[PDB]
A paper describes a structure:
We identified DR1245, a protein of unknown function conserved only in the Deinococcaceae, as a DdrB partner in cells recovering from ionizing radiation treatment. Our study indicates that cells devoid of DR1245 grow more slowly under normal (unstressed) growth conditions than wild-type cells, but are as radioresistant as wild type. The three-dimensional structure of DR1245 revealed its strong structural homology with type III secretion system (T3SS) chaperones and with the YbjN homolog from Synechococcus elongatus. Thus, the DR1245 protein might have some chaperone activity towards DdrB and possibly other substrates.
To determine the phases, native DR1245 were formed in the presence of potassium bromide and 2 Å resolution electron density maps were produced by single-wavelength anomalous dispersion and a molecular model was built. The asymmetric unit was composed of two monomers, which corroborates the results from the size exclusion chromatography presented above. The final model includes 301 of the 306 residues from the dimer, including residues 2 to 153, and 4 to 152, of monomers A and B, respectively. Each DR1245 monomer comprises 3 α-helices packed against one side of a twisted six-stranded anti-parallel β-sheet with an α-β-β-β-α-β-β-α topology. The DR1245 dimerization interface involves residues from the β3 to β4 loop that interact with the beginning of the α3 helix of the other monomer. The surface area buried per monomer in the dimer interface is 1,425 Å2 or 15.4% of the total surface area, as defined by the PISA server. Interestingly, the dimerization interface harbors a cavity that contains water molecules and the bromide ion. A sulfate and a potassium ion are localized at both sides of the cavity and are each coordinated by the His129 from one monomer and Arg59 from the other monomer. The two monomers are highly symmetrical except for their unstructured 11 C-terminus residues. The C-terminus from monomer A is packed against its α3 helix and β2 strand whereas the C-terminus from monomer B protrudes away to interact with the C-terminus of the A monomer from a symmetric neighboring molecule.
Residue numbers in the entry:
A (entry chain A): 2 to 153
B (entry chain B): 4 to 152
The structure:
Amino acid sequence: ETALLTLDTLAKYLQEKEVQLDIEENGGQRFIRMGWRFEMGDAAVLVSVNDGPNNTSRLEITCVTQKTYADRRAEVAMMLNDRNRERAFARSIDQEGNVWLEYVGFYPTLAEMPQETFDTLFGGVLMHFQDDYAALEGYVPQEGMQIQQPQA
Amino acid sequence: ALLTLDTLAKYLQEKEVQLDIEENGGQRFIRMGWRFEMGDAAVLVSVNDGPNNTSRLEITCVTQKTYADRRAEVAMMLNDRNRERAFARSIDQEGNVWLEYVGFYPTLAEMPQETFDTLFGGVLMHFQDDYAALEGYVPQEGMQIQQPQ
Ligand SMILES: [Br-]
Ligand SMILES: [K+]
């Protein structure tokens, strides 16, 4: 009804789920920074809302592994390549070997952004990232991977 | 002007785009061919209405040129672009190159023509950039200068 796409609206949604976060600023652009501890390793999660021309804004969510895989770079690139076609989101491995998963959505500026939609999107990003992270780490627990993992 | 496939097709048709609406599986989608200076492409658009009152808007471009002989090199090139630029690039087993946009919206979200045109334009521009890099494109042929008349 009244919640629009702004960094403060998304921070509130994250706070409401008791996610610990800080709001930072580089250049002119503010962003939300979060740490996240997955079963198989730690990660950074970033969120920003960037305005553009033509009254359109970009919601960007980014996950990056703390762990690095520089010694398996070609192998990882091909694994991520196949997921980039079959699934949502954009994965890559950088020169240092950290693995990234990114989301970019384009919205009319100050579009309605309901809590349910953001939670679905955000949860979706984390679940896809966790799946890739589990594959890199060869993590395949007997009980199966928990769909909902604590930031802890 | 809500997010429905029919709305998006109206926006494209308003811009004189040639398109067909098709059904595969249970999902309807818009199918288009696109001509770039360095090669042709398939361009697909769908709106998939999912759970938690959230829908996915998907826009996909696929090169008709193929790069299977260069698969590893292309994969690394796309990888680096996937880190630094919008959207998700990949190369498939046949060697065709894909660029995907997958956006999440409240179901039946407002989707003004100005935003869709910016989004759709941005996808095409990014894909053209990648296609140009793959092909090493340089304008090869000049303007014919003979006038009307
Ligand atoms: Br993406
Ligand atoms: K998916």
